[PDB]
Design a protein around this ligand. Structure first.
Ligand SMILES: CCN(CC)CCOc1ccc(Nc2ncc3c(n2)N(C)C(=O)N(c2c(Cl)cccc2Cl)C3)cc1
Length: 271
């Protein structure tokens, strides 16, 4: 749909970039203001850094997937520099936030709450026949009321039937990624479940990197032995066992995200 005909296209002058939140090979992310009063996040493409088509593919994706638990697309400036404008999450990244004085004082009760919120947002994605493919604490954003939303859909995909096969030449975080997606390049919603498992250790340890003390090769090597990650410290055994359902060897044995949400909400309302 043409920009002059697009409902998401906005005049670059409606925007006011105020503070850089981060800069990368491909552009920057800013906090700014839309039409004066509304705080937004803005992500701009570095001309040259990559394809405008590739950059925008993410925003187009977010036109379809909308939900209180997913970060909301606001608008695009589809002329250079190109902008993607989203709602602004005040506490930023979950992984950063958990290391703060505030997140550090977070009770296990609240942490299980946050985890049920992330599972819930993944449930919506699940039923819409999407996979995320990059699920980990870094890609979860925290609002000023301490609620959680899934972000970053650059790698997300619709699944025509069953699964997605990656190309010969794509890499993924080895520690968050399900074996089958490492070995055969095959992704399903069920390997997002694996990642949600690593994400939970990432939560209960207030941000610590999964598989402490281990290199990627060691991790791969131990998983093939049937070993899974060692119980994180101060991890309720109820919770540790849930992570283990996520790390089932056969993909189809791993639970649904709606199941996960149910269980986590039982844990939460229990404590
Ligand atoms: C270095 C110091 N540090 C503070 C300690 C600064 C960082 O702290 C913050 C604070 C608040 C935010 N808030 C924030 N809200 C929404 C989005 C976002 N950040 N980022 C980084 C995106 O890439 N977005 C996004 C996405 Cl995921 C896709 C497409 C477009 C956008 Cl804007 C959505 C982010 C970071």
């Amino acid at each position: 749909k043409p920009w002059w005909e697009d409902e998401w296209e906005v005049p670059r002058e409606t925007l006011k970039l105020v503070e850089r939140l981060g800069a990368g090979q491909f552009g920057e992310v800013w906090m700014g203001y839309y039409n004066g009063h509304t705080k937004v996040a803005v992500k701009s493409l570095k001309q040259g850094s990559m394809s405008p088509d590739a950059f925008l593919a993410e925003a187009n994706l977010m036109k379809q997937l909308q939900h209180q638990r997913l970060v909301r697309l606001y608008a695009v400036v589809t002329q250079e520099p190109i902008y993607i404008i989203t709602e602004y999450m005040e506490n930023g990244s979950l992984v950063d936030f958990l290391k703060t004085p505030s997140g550090i004082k977070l009770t296990i009760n609240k942490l299980l709450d946050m985890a049920a919120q992330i599972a819930e947002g993944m449930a919506f994605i699940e039923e819409r026949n999407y996979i995320h493919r990059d699920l980990r604490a870094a890609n979860i954003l925290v609002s000023d009321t301490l609620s959680c939303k899934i972000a970053d859909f650059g790698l997300a995909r619709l699944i025509e039937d069953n699964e997605y096969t990656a190309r010969e030449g794509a890499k993924f975080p080895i520690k968050w990624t399900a074996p089958e997606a490492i070995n055969y390049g095959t992704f399903t919603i069920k390997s997002d479940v694996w990642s949600f498992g690593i994400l939970l250790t990432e939560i209960v340890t207030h941000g610590r990197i999964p598989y402490p003390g281990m290199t990627n090769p060691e991790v791969i090597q131990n998983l093939e032995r049937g070993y899974r990650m060692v119980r994180p410290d101060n991890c309720p055994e109820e919770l540790y066992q849930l992570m283990r359902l996520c790390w089932k060897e056969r993909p189809e044995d791993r639970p649904t995200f709606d199941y996960l949400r149910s269980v986590l909400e039982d844990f939460f309302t229990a404590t």
